[PDB]
Amino acid sequence: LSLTADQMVSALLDAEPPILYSESEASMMGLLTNLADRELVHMINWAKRVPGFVDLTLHDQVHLLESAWLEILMIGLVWRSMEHPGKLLFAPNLLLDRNQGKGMVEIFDMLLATSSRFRMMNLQGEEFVCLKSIILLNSGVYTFSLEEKDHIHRVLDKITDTLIHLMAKAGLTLQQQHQRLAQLLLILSHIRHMSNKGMEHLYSVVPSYDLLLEMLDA
Amino acid sequence: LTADQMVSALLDAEPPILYSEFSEASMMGLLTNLADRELVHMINWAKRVPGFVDLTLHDQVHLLESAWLEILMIGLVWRSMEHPGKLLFAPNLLLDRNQGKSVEGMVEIFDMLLATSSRFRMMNLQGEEFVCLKSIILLNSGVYTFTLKSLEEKDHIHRVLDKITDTLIHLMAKAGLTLQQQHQRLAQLLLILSHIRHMSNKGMEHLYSMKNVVPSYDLLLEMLDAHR
Numbered sequence: 001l002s003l004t005a006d007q008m009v010s011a012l013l014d015a016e017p018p019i020l021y022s023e024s025e026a027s028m029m030g031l032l033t034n035l036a037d038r039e040l041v042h043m044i045n046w047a048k049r050v051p052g053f054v055d056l057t058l059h060d061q062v063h064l065l066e067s068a069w070l071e072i073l074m075i076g077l078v079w080r081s082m083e084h085p086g087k088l089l090f091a092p093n094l095l096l097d098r099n100q101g102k103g104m105v106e107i108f109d110m111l112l113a114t115s116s117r118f119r120m121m122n123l124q125g126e127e128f129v130c131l132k133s134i135i136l137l138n139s140g141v142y143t144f145s146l147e148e149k150d151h152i153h154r155v156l157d158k159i160t161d162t163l164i165h166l167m168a169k170a171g172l173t174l175q176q177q178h179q180r181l182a183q184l185l186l187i188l189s190h191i192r193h194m195s196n197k198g199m200e201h202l203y204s205v206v207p208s209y210d211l212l213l214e215m216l217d218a
Numbered sequence: 219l220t221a222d223q224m225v226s227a228l229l230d231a232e233p234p235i236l237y238s239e240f241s242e243a244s245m246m247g248l249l250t251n252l253a254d255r256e257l258v259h260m261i262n263w264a265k266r267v268p269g270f271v272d273l274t275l276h277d278q279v280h281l282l283e284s285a286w287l288e289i290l291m292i293g294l295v296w297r298s299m300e301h302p303g304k305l306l307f308a309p310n311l312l313l314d315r316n317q318g319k320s321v322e323g324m325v326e327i328f329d330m331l332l333a334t335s336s337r338f339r340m341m342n343l344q345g346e347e348f349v350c351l352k353s354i355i356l357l358n359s360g361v362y363t364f365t366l367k368s369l370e371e372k373d374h375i376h377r378v379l380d381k382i383t384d385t386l387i388h389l390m391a392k393a394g395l396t397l398q399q400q401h402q403r404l405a406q407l408l409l410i411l412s413h414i415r416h417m418s419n420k421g422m423e424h425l426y427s428m429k430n431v432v433p434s435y436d437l438l439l440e441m442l443d444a445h446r
């Protein structure tokens with residue numbers, strides 16, 4: 001909460017998790033499930049390095065991860081796929097196009113369109129890691145103590161300050177800084193929608209509290 | 219449009235507060251009837267949101283198909299803002315969460331609505347901010363799920379969303395917030411739109427679990443597609 005915007009960016013950039021590799025349709029879904037399961041462990045490690053996260057109770061950290069993990073998996077997929085129009089880069093050895101998706105193809109198309117939007121806004125890495133932290137802190141805050149929510153709101157305020165700082169350094173006018181901040185946060189409501197539809201697809205499943213708690217390694 | 223002209227147009231577009239036409243058995247019937255009547259006024263409101271009628275009728279329908287439940291829910295939260303623990307579906311239909319326990323799955327959504335109302339209250343959300351947020355929902359909700367014409371439409375929607383951002387900022391500056399406070403408040407408002415998107419998805423699931431579940435394409439087209 002005392003970190004400068006430069007130090008917040010550096011912390012987030014240093015916390016970035018690694019890109020993992022993948023290990024017919026049936027084998028395709030098994031591969032994707034296994035990849036997501038391995039990514040989750042790295043996601044927990046990443047979350048523990050987001051400044052402010054571990055000041056929350058363990059119970060609240062678990063709730064935030066429960067609400068956010070699918071959104072975080074999807075935004076990372078969208079980021080990896082930016083430079084690959086029309087395809088989704090699940091892993092460096094697992095690049096799929098829309099035809100391989102043929103309720104899969106509707107979510108596949110939403111993800112491709114998000115990656116398209118990122119590509120047209122020329123989303124930067126520094127902006128991406130702030131967006132990912134906002135998903136972690138924002139997604140479960142409405143659905144939980146009041147001190148905990150205050151702390152989460154103070155951290156979100158710091159990430160907003162950091163996003164604005166990055167845009168100012170890139171030379172954006174104040175008007176362009178506000179407009180870009182808004183454009184980026186409006187994409188998060190589309191990522192929320194995808195995660196909701198993504199969950200509906202998966203149930204047609206979630207990591208348990210105990211599993212998340214164990215990976216947090218109190 | 220200037221920011222002040224944008225606010226004025228949105229305030230003048232605001233639909234009226236409707237009334238319900240009581241027992242737990244009749245509750246879903248009253249709510250359905252109320253929402254059906256609200257949808258008609260929502261259509262008239264959307265046509266008055268600057269830039270909306272520049273779109274094709276097809277795209278207008280698609281935005282309303284994406285956004286209509288979010289828009290009903292945000293109005294409900296706004297009407298309930300000053301009534302802690304209650305949802306003011308209508309001035310004569312004010313429910314608490316024990317009344318939501320009647321239908322399976324209802325209390326979960328009721329609690330999400332109550333938490334949003336509580337958040338609006340904690341932020342002291344102003345009416346001018348509210349109408350901006352509702353217009354953002356209409357323009358943003360269906361834009362990621364829409365070809366030369368499509369590119370032109372998306373560019374136009376993003377330009378109108380940028381104008382509403384400038385309007386939100388102007389409202390906060392004219393009220394004397396600092397630049398830091400302006401950016402922080404803008405972010406806090408827009409992040410609430412993710413929760414509203416979440417509530418609308420859970421709500422749609424709830425509506426299908428009961429099962430005329432949504433306004434059809436042609437119904438929306440019919441109401442949007444007016445003659446002269």
Ligand SMILES: CCN1CC[C@H](Oc2ccc([C@@H]3c4ccc(O)cc4CC4(CC4)N3C(=O)c3ccccc3)cc2)C1
Pocket residue numbers: 032033034035036037039040073074076077090101103104105107108111198201202205206207
């Ligand atoms: C941790 C929870 N359990 C373990 C995993 C199970 O959930 C899963 C979670 C994620 C996926 C993949 C996956 C993998 C890696 C990634 O980076 C991202 C994704 C994205 C994603 C979610 C949309 N997905 C799909 O397949 C998909 C993509 C396009 C259209 C339709 C579907 C599979 C299963 C339960």
Ligand SMILES: CCN1CC[C@H](Oc2ccc([C@@H]3c4ccc(O)cc4CC4(CC4)N3C(=O)c3ccccc3)cc2)C1
Pocket residue numbers: 249250251252253254256257290291293294307318323324325327328331421424425430431432433
């Ligand atoms: C236009 C479509 N038809 C309309 C009827 C069908 O959709 C409907 C749309 C809305 C509702 C109400 C309703 C009414 C007015 C309002 O301002 C807001 C709402 C909100 C709401 C949606 C969550 N709701 C519920 O009951 C509810 C409230 C609390 C918890 C769980 C459920 C009923 C039915 C198809």
